[PDB]
Amino acid sequence: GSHMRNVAAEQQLRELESTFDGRLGFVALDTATGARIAHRADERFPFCSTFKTMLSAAVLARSAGDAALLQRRIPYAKRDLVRYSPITEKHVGAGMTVAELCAATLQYSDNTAADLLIALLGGPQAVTAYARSIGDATFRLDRRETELNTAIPGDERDTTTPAAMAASVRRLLVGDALGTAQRAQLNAWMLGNKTGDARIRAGVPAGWRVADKTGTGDYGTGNDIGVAYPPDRAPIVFVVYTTMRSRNAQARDDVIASAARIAARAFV
Numbered sequence: 001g002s003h004m005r006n007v008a009a010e011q012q013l014r015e016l017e018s019t020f021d022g023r024l025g026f027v028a029l030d031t032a033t034g035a036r037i038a039h040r041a042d043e044r045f046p047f048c049s050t051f052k053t054m055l056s057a058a059v060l061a062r063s064a065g066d067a068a069l070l071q072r073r074i075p076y077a078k079r080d081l082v083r084y085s086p087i088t089e090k091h092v093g094a095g096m097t098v099a100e101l102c103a104a105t106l107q108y109s110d111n112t113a114a115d116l117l118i119a120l121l122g123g124p125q126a127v128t129a130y131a132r133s134i135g136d137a138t139f140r141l142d143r144r145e146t147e148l149n150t151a152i153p154g155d156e157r158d159t160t161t162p163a164a165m166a167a168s169v170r171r172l173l174v175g176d177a178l179g180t181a182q183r184a185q186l187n188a189w190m191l192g193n194k195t196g197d198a199r200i201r202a203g204v205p206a207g208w209r210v211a212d213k214t215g216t217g218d219y220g221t222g223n224d225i226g227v228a229y230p231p232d233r234a235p236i237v238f239v240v241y242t243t244m245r246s247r248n249a250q251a252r253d254d255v256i257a258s259a260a261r262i263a264a265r266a267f268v
């Protein structure tokens with residue numbers, strides 16, 4: 001890549017933001033060199049379901065010290081389900097194992113699976129504590145699903161910054177904070193994500209494998225975080241947060257994909 005291309009990419013992110021009635025938070029990191037392409041890197045954004053990556057990492061970290069945890073079954077009933085539970089609704093009664101709940105929350109964004117894992121860890125503050133333990137002094141999880149998606153302007157609950165989340169994704173997916181096996185497992189789950197086809201994945205070449213987690217909420221909030229793995233090249237971290245001025249705006253998959261494409265083309 002080049003410094004000149006990175007600067008030009010940051011200008012194209014400004015131009016992209018001018019095209020819609022909201023704001024764009026963006027960090028992409030080329031881990032070959034640490035080079036960065038950013039827009040609003042240090043502003044807070046409502047992270048919505050992208051926190052499910054941090055949640056799952058916290059569960060994996062606890063399993064490193066507990067050989068029974070990943071196969072532990074957590075029963076739940078139909079009345080326990082929260083809105084948008086495509087996988088967990090199929091397994092009411094005996095429930096699912098902790099590993100299955102991680103996979104469900106990561107790959108389908110299942111909200112009951114998330115709530116079960118937040119509760120297992122001891123509540124939202126345990127997820128914030130895990131983030132602090134991997135060097136993220138910015139991330140905060142305050143509420144559970146689905147209230148954490150309110151995305152009210154000026155509200156700092158359930159927010160992070162693009163820069164903080166890009167460093168955490170890099171540490172979790174590319175570095176070895178989970179230990180080599182846990183790291184591989186988190187990557188595999190996010191590589192098998194079913195909800196991201198129109199977001200970062202739509203902006204990168206077909207040969208780049210993307211481990212990502214999406215988020216969607218009120219105020220047209222549309223997010224995607226993860227790591228792209230070009231073949232035989234260092235990984236590239238992508239964090240894309242967008243949120244709109246109107247409470248009932250639609251999320252914009254095309255803007256997320258465009259922002260990713262700007263950085264993929266600048267780095268490649």
Ligand SMILES: CC(C)(O/N=C(\C(=O)NCB(O)O)c1csc(N)n1)C(=O)O
Pocket residue numbers: 048049050083084109111145146148149150214215216217218219
């Ligand atoms: C998974 C689904 C249904 O998500 N849309 C959701 C939602 O529950 N997202 C879970 B997450 O982004 O924390 C949501 C909350 S408020 C709002 N408006 N939308 C989606 O993106 O298809």
